[PDB]
Design a protein around this ligand. Structure first.
Ligand SMILES: [Zn+2]
Lengths: 114, 59, 65
């Protein structure tokens, strides 16, 4: 049931609602909307997509000094290790971007150009 | 491109993907070929059934 | 580096593959080449507990007075 909702609005006041979901499995999935249809992506993908970073930078980003949350230590290990399970071949951020472009190229209408 | 679209769909939704896949199941090969021959025979039956109406417009 | 039950690549920071899924000792990094269990192991253990929420009862209230 738990989840976060942030309504990001661009300077021009056009809005875009972004949701985070906690799966029972520890997995977190991100909801968004494109061509007013909804689309779900694993959050660790959008993280590795934003900036080149280490796994330790994301881990440190979330729990940080909070080293005592066995609850969070284990859920977050499920998250990162689980991503390592699904995508052993996304070794760098650029490749990840290639995976996103490849999977949305049909709908972002950028093709024969981008 | 539709197939590629399907891939995008695969990432987005398990459930919706399931629905589209179901649509594919419904299609199947569509015209089967052996089936097509049998159907041709059926078409002959249709010939009998057919509403042999006329030229429609010229008349 | 090893923290809690996570072990990060010491050179690259990658949460390298668990010493349990290795045949050698040195868990080698998928980004770096470092040894590991070849070097021992973070005797991975966590003292996990209940949140003191799963178990409502009058007796829980008897812990409150
Ligand atoms: Zn490394």
């Amino acid at each position: 049931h738990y989840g976060i909702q942030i309504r990001s609005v661009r300077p021009d006041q056009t809005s875009q609602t972004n949701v985070l979901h906690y799966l029972n499995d520890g997995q977190v999935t991100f909801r968004f909307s494109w061509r007013k249809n909804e689309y779900l992506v694993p959050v660790v993908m959008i993280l590795k997509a934003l900036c080149h970073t280490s796994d330790r930078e994301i881990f440190d980003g979330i729990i940080g000094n909070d080293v005592k949350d066995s609850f969070l230590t284990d859920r977050l290990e499920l998250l990162l290790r689980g991503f390592k399970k699904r995508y052993p071949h996304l070794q760098n951020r650029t490749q990840v971007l290639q995976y996103l472009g490849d999977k949305f190229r049909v709908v972002f209408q950028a093709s024969p150009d981008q | 491109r539709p197939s590629a679209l399907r891939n995008a769909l695969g990432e987005a939704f398990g459930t919706k993907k399931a629905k589209k896949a179901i649509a594919d199941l419904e299609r199947n090969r569509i015209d089967s070929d052996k089936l097509t021959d049998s159907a041709i025979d059926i078409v002959d039956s249709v010939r009998t059934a057919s509403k042999d109406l006329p030229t429609r417009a010229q008349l | 580096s090893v923290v809690g039950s996570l072990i990060f690549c010491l050179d690259c920071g990658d949460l390298l593959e668990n010493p349990n899924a290795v045949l050698g000792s040195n868990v080698e990094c998928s980004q770096c080449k470092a040894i590991y269990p070849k070097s021992q192991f973070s005797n991975l253990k966590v003292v996990t507990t209940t949140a003191d929420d799963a178990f409502p009862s009058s007796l829980r209230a008897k812990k409150s007075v």
